[PDB]
Every structure is written in structure tokens, then in C-alpha cells.
Design a protein around this ligand. Structure first.
Ligand SMILES: Nc1c(O)cccc1C(=O)O
Ligand SMILES: Nc1c(O)cccc1C(=O)O
Ligand SMILES: [Mg+2]
Ligand SMILES: [Zn+2]
Ligand SMILES: [Zn+2]
Lengths: 495, 503
């Protein structure tokens, strides 16, 4: 048991229903849960109400030189670190001058994207259980280090049980998934090609659900996803709808992500993504739609009528050549209309924008588009990365805000340097001039996992070295990159 | 004399083993590169082994005193050239500042937001001369030195004033004391747009404003450091008479100077310009002879096709500040898309921070913003490459400032103005492009070392000669006096905020 902890004296951002901020606020936790949060004097009354033996062992943390946030909920993420040598990765020349528009850039290479997604099952099968565990634990550590206390898999190039084991070892919360692709859009065909049977794909998810059902930690859940609506048969869509109704689960997919998606969907499936999801019964409160910007008026109305959720990743669109913010403006418009919209990192094969970077991006970019410095307030960017993300993941019963009865998941950020001087809004200074590396302390269920920007039980150097060994094996064996190209890069690593 | 500020010659320095970004004309990047400097200048830059050959060619006495810096765990950048900045820290209590409630929930669209409150902006700018006069020499010195220190700390080695609420000679003295380079200016507003009037109100004589700039130019003509230049500006085309515009054109031709102003900054600007001046900003500048190669235009996004053609024909320069538009409620990137379009058409476009009264986005944050935002708008990850974002904050900015003779790139004969950033942590692991990792996950505070003219001013993220706590405390004392006396904020509101400061 973690017993009682009092974190007192800092600026506390709650992300509660009123987006409450407490200057010189305090948080009292007992075991895994928040018990009191508000002005220091009010929380001191809760301290006096503790069991005497619990009060005797109270851990008092003077956070007067810090800001307190809820733990970040990154509900749209992919484990892709196994592709570090090949995907925008380690073998590129140092000069960027010859870079080309490719993959998700220029409206999207829909054939290449579809084929790449349909290859995941084969590559996951080729990865060893040991490689999967080493790569997952390092990849998920990097999320935790940047303040992500609850992480959502929306389809990973890794083994689901390896990622569950990594989350268990790290102490973070994880919504696990399985890879789901049962169709490919091929250049030499006028219609989708079925690549595997929907019932087998659904059985893979049911096997994961069976494996994590008996989790006693409260830190492991699961959520089925479809990779991308291009790679989704009507049978897979209807099967997902039946599965999430039967098990009372959330559902996630990627839809309306790219300019070129709608034409490819009409050519290969006869209908666009949101309308295909709607026909299957998937456009409802359970849906987290990744990106979801290339929607016509009817699809926007389906999302609003269904009270579906959009996860937006404005920190990473430009470097991918994606245009899911400004080309249509649909996601900010649906948010203004009162659709739930959260912020997520998406992912790549090397470290990219974290939640802190994504919060800055939304604050800058949504506000500039509308000439309105109030459209996304800093506290809105925080809500979008905590409470609203937890609601989309159906984990807001336990996480996403600092309120009595919720899990004691919180971050401390130091505010005593030049960036924060004279600002009564330390979260604003954090969005101007700080990021993932400025997360100092990470607490999950009352347990400190990160302190002073260092792992408490995590050995960062040990996780890194096991990840690099695993990456070497997978890259040379499964991706067939010559050892002659890999080993000199690993020899360069600053240990 | 220079000796008042710093003493001694820097001799030879070899910075070797890191990834070196030159921002030279070829945007050259050297993995395991090196930079050899002698006194104030770069002598050689390239692969470590090639630069070692240049070390062997040094004068023996110079080689005997060579300082070798192991940059193997670092990235080397040119010093940032922030050519569009304002000293505004005197307004820390009033401008999106220290007296706001901690909750942001009641914030309103105001000032620059919602297309721009053109009357309020114009009136605010025209009040600067009175507030600068009200500021004491001691207040000006303390506020300038801390404000400009924060720029230097974030890797700005060359800073351009485009109109400050501070005393010009106080900012020049601050730059001399800090060891950085500075393009000084003077405040220039001779018109205001008032609600109850059919044309602009002339608020002072153009010759007064011109004389103020000529006095600064006279004061810094005698500068022996090579670190101080000056450039006249007009605050904003709203606050500019035809007489001031023509006087500025005559002055920059006679003295062979660059010129800067703000134009096409806001949706509501064009209608206000037509209502009060009979013509929009770029066309008024063009009529005065100011749309030419000397011009650095701040923001410059709300331009019609004819105004875009005037800028291209004149080969003018735009300084863009995409890191800070959203928090001001500005729309100078996406509403028109003009600045990325002019860049694609071959106009010189640089990146700058603009400024506010408290720390905001620095150059590192602005480079990330351009990389994300220009590329997302075009669905093109190659429109602004990371090395383009660096060029826009170094060499191209120096060209717009007319300082590219000496700064903005690591090339033989240019000034030894360099940054080091540590690249040994998780953010950079396996990336052969550390600048890309820096744009993803780092910023101003990750600048480790700052060298100007071969002299280390910042090392391990700390001032070498700067007393950080002392600069801060002098700034806070100066801010207290100015805020209570000149801005008439009650001491009862100011003192509790100063009592809260964490020392
Ligand atoms: N980023 C994506 C995109 O542009 C299209 C389809 C899927 C994704 C993704 O986030 O996996
Ligand atoms: N940011 C500005 C604006 O929006 C209008 C006019 C001037 C400025 C400025 O940068 O000073
Ligand atoms: Mg509008
Ligand atoms: Zn995704
Ligand atoms: Zn400006």
C-alpha cells in the first residue's frame, strides 16, 4: 500500500469538469486514490480526517516550486520502435536536402499505406517474444518519461502480450489492442482484396481480452481497433460492432485521415470511411476516430449525432506531410460544435512529439486558424490530453483528472526557472518553453515511477541497451537490413 | 572602449566530434564535423579529419594555445539571428502579464486577436514615446539587460530591435555588457487612428522621429566591438505619415542602411488603412520607395496580389513569427497562406520570435512551429526541411538584417558565433539528424553553450560572465519602479507578485 501522500504548495491543474486551477493548491492521496484536492487549507482538513496510523506515516512533498498536472492520457499511440532502422529512421543521410514527399504526404499514397498496414501481421509473427518485450518496454518507458500515465494502443508493430508485460513491469496504465487488417487496396484491382477472415481477426482480439480479463492491478484494459478503414471489410466492421456491444468496450480506428482516402474508399469499397463505419453501427459514443478531418457534411453530422470522439495529433502532421488540421478545418469546427476532441501523439519508429509538444501545437495552431487566443486555452489543451482523452478511452471512471475518488496519477514539473518567472499561469509558460523532458515526477496509483526526470525502479540505460540488442536482431533477421549497415550505427550510440 | 566589457583575445579553438550544421549556402551538415576558430572568426569547418589538417597549418604559437572542445556528445549550430524582436519586459505587469488570474477560463479575444482592434493597437503604439521618456536610465539598463540575456540564453547571438519600449542606448549598453550582437533601433510612431476622426491624427513631427534615429546612428558609429549596428524602423504602417515614410527612405539611402516595419499583420488592417490613410500598407511603403531589398517586413501576410507582386519585384524580405500567432489571436499564417506562397515564389522569408512582456517562444520554438505548420498546410514534409528552419533563423535572417557579411553561417571568414546542444539523451538516440530530434523534443532551454566572436558566454546552460540571479533581481526592482510610477499600477497589486518570486 502507498499510504497517504500530501503534495502541497504548487499550482495544481485538476482538469476537473470546471478545468479548476488552484494556486498554492494541494493533493491528498491515500493508497491508489485522490482523497482531497483544492486550496491547501481545505486539504489540511482532509489530512486531519485520516486514520491516525495512516496520518503518522503521511509523506509530505513541498511542491511550492512546482506545477501539479493530472497524468497524461495518450489514447492514440502505436508501438513502432522495431522499425527504427527503416521508417524515417537511423539509416537516413544526415543531410535532409534530398527528402521526397512519400507515404502519408502529398494527400497519401493509398496503395502503399494499405499494403504496409496489411504486412504488420507477418512482421509481428517474425518478431521474437524477447525482442517484442525489450522494444515495447523501452518504447513505453519513453511515453511514461514524458508524463503518459495511461497509454492507448491503436495498432502496433509489436506482440500484444509483450506490451501488456512491459506496462505491468513499468507500473503505467495500458489499453492493449491487436492488429486488425483484413483487406488491401492493390494497384492491379478495381475492388478491395480480402487478405484474411474477419472472424479469425476478431478471435485474435478475443484471445487478448481473455488474457487481461483476470488483471488485478487495475492498470490493464483492452480496446479493439481496426488498423484503417481502407483495410476493413464490412464483415470485420459488423464483427467489431457485435464484439464491443457484447463486452461493453470502447472501439478505435483511423478514418478521414488523408486527402486521397475518400476517392480510394469509393473506388475499392463503394463508400467513404465514416459512412461505412456508420452502416456497421460503429459511429457512436464508443468510437475514437484517429485524425477524422476529411469528412463531408453528412459524415460530420453522423459523428455529432453519434457523440463519437476524435483523437487529433497536430504535433506530428507536418513532418509526415499530413494536412489533417488546416486543409479542411473540420476537427476544430467539430470541437466548437461540442464533439469530444482529444490530443494524442500518434507514433513513429524514433522519438517524436510527446503529449506536452502536442498540447503546445494545439494551443498555437487551433488559435491561429480562428484568430482567437481563447479557442484552445492552455487548460483546454491540458483537458484534451487528460480528462477528454480518458473519456474517449472509456477510462474517465478512474483517470484523466485530479478529483476525489479518481486514481492518484499525477505529474510534477519544476517552475522555479526563468521560463516561469512572474507568470501566474505556469501551464502557459510550460506550453511556451517546456516539453516532455521537463516532466520531473510521474506518480501512478500513488506510486512514484519517475523523480527528477529519472526512473525510480526503471534503469533507463539497461532498457536502452536491451532495446538496441532486440532492434539489431529484428532489423537484420526480419527486415533483412545488412549487419554492415546496422552495426556502425549501434557503435555510434553515446552510452 | 571594448575593454570595459570583456578582456583578452580568444586565440584558436577546435570544436570537434559532433554533428555540425553550417547553414552555409549549400545547407551543409557534417556528421563528426569540426569548427576551427581563431580569435573572432571561423577559419575551417568540415569533416573532423579535414579540419585537423587546418590545425596543423596554424601559426605555431597559436597552435600551442589551441583550446580543444570535445563536442562528440553535441550538435553544433550557427548562433541564432533573431532579426524581429521587441524589448517589452517593462510591460510584464499589464501585457498578458503578471496580474492575470491563474485560471484562463474568463480570457477574452482582445488586442491583436479577432482580426485586430486597430484603434487600440494604434493608440497603444503611439503611447510608447511617453512611456520610454518616463523610464529612468537605471530602469532601462536593468530591464534591457535581463530581457536580452533571456534571448542570449536561448542561443540568440545576433538580435534585431524592430521597436522597443526601452531606451535605445540602454539596449546598446546591455548588448555590450552581455557580449552579444545587436541591431539597435528607435521608436517611430507619428500618427494614430482614433475612433472619432476621418483621417489619421499626426502625433509628432516626422523630423523629430528621424532626428531620434540619427542620434542613435551617431552614438553607435564609434563602436569598436563589431557587435553593434542599427536599423531604422517604423512601428506599424497605421502609425506612419507619408512624411515619415519618405524621410525613412531618404535616411536609409543616404546612410546605406536596412529598413524594417510591420505591415499586412492583421485581417482588419487593410480597411483601417483605407479609412485613415486612403491606401493599404504595402502600397503606401511602395509609394515612399521603401519596398526594395533593404526592407524587412514583419508578418506581411495580409497582402493582395498587387502587394505580393510589389514585394517580389522589390526583392524585399519577410520576417515571420509562427511560434506566437495563436496565443495573440493572430492569423498571419493560415488565413491567407501568403507568406509560405511568397517563399515558394523565391522571396526571402526568415523566422523570428516577435516579443511579449514575459518569456514566450524563442527561436528554437519558432523553428519547430515553421517545420510543423508550413509542411502541414502544403501536405508536404519537404516544404520546410529542418535545415530550412535553421537557415530561416540564421543565414536568411542575417541577409534580411544586412549582417550576413559577418554572421548567420559557419563558413571561413564569418564570425565564430556558435551554439552547442547536448544530443546524448533519449530524444536523439539513433537519429542521424539531431536537428530533427531538437525540433521534435527540445527548445531554448536545451541550448548548452553559446559562443560569440570565439568567446563562451553560456556553458552548461549557465552564464559564464552573467550573474543570472543578480540580473533577475535588478530587473524585478526596475520593473517595480516603472510599473508603480509610469504605468500607475498600485504597489498593493505589484508587491505581492514580487513577494511570490522563487529565488
Ligand atoms: N497517420 C495515419 C494516416 O495519415 C492514415 C492512416 C493511419 C494513420 C495512423 O495514425 O496510423
Ligand atoms: N504582432 C504585431 C501585429 O499583429 C500588428 C502590428 C505589429 C505587430 C508587432 O509585431 O509589433
Ligand atoms: Mg473566423
Ligand atoms: Zn495512428
Ligand atoms: Zn513585431
Amino acid at each position: 500500500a502507498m499510504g497517504a501522500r500530501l503534495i502541497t504548495g504548487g499550482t495544481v491543474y485538476t482538469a476537473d469538469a470546471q478545468e479548476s486551477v488552484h494556486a498554492r493548491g494541494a493533493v491528498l492521496t491515500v493508497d491508489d486514490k485522490v482523497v482531497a484536492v483544492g486550496p491547501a487549507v481545505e486539504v489540511e482538513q482532509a489530512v486531519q480526517a485520516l486514520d491516525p496510523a495512516v496520518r503518522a506515516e503521511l509523506r509530505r512533498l513541498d511542491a511550492s516550486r512546482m506545477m501539479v498536472l493530472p497524468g497524461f492520457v495518450n489514447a492514440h499511440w502505436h508501438e513502432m520502435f522495431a522499425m527504427g532502422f527503416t521508417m524515417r529512421g537511423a539509416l537516413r543521410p544526415p543531410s535532409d536536402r534530398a527528402d521526397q514527399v512519400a507515404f502519408m504526404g502529398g494527400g497519401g499514397d493509398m496503395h502503399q499505406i494499405s499494403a504496409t498496414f496489411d504486412r504488420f501481421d507477418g512482421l509481428i509473427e517474425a518478431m521474437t517474444e524477447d525482442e517484442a518485450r525489450a522494444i515495447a518496454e523501452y518504447s513505453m518507458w519513453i511515453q511514461l518519461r514524458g508524463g503518459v500515465t495511461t497509454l492507448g494502443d491503436m495498432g502496433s508493430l509489436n506482440r500484444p502480450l509483450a506490451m501488456v508485460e512491459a506496462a505491468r513491469r513499468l507500473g503505467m496504465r495500458f489499453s492493449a489492442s491487436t492488429w486488425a487488417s483484413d483487406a488491401v487496396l492493390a494497384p492491379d484491382r478495381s475492388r478491395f482484396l480480402r487478405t484474411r477472415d474477419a472472424d479469425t481477426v476478431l478471435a485474435s482480439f478475443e484471445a487478448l481480452l481473455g488474457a487481461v480479463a483476470a488483471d488485478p492491478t487495475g492498470r490493464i484494459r483492452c480496446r479493439p481497433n481496426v488498423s484503417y478503414v481502407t483495410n476493413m471489410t464490412d464483415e470485420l466492421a459488423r464483427g467489431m460492432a457485435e464484439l464491443v456491444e457484447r463486452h461493453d468496450l470502447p472501439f478505435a480506428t483511423h478514418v478521414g485521415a488523408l486527402r486521397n482516402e475518400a476517392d480510394a474508399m469509393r473506388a475499392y469499397h463503394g463508400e467513404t470511411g465514416v459512412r461505412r463505419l456508420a452502416e456497421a453501427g460503429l459511429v457512436d459514443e464508443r468510437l475514437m476516430a484517429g485524425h477524422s478531418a476529411f469528412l463531408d457534411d453528412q459524415e460530420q453530422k453522423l459523428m455529432l449525432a453519434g457523440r463519437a470522439h476524435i483523437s487529433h495529433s497536430p504535433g506530428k502532421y507536418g513532418p509526415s506531410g499530413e494536412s489533417a488540421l488546416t486543409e479542411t478545418g473540420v476537427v476544430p469546427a467539430l470541437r466548437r460544435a461540442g464533439l469530444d476532441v482529444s490530443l494524442s501523439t500518434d507514433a513513429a519508429a524514433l522519438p517524436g512529439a510527446g503529449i506536452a509538444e502536442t498540447m503546445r501545437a494545439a494551443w498555437q495552431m487551433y488559435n491561429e486558424m480562428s484568430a482567437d487566443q481563447t479557442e484552445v486555452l492552455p487548460t483546454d489543451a491540458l483537458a484534451m490530453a487528460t480528462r477528454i482523452a480518458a473519456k474517449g478511452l472509456r477510462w474517465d471512471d478512474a483517470v484523466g483528472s485530479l478529483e476525489p475518488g479518481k486514481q492518484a496519477d499525477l505529474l510534477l514539473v519544476r517552475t522555479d526557472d526563468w521560463r516561469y518567472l512572474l507568470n501566474p499561469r505556469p501551464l502557459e509558460s510550460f506550453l511556451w518553453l517546456a516539453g516532455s523532458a521537463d516532466v520531473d515526477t510521474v506518480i501512478v496509483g500513488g506510486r512514484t515511477l519517475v523523480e527528477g526526470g529519472r526512473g525510480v525502479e526503471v534503469d533507463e540505460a539497461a532498457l536502452r541497451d536491451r532495446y538496441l540488442q532486440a532492434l539489431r536482431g529484428f532489423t537484420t533477421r526480419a527486415l533483412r537490413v545488412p549487419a554492415e549497415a546496422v552495426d556502425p550505427v549501434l557503435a555510434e550510440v553515446a552510452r
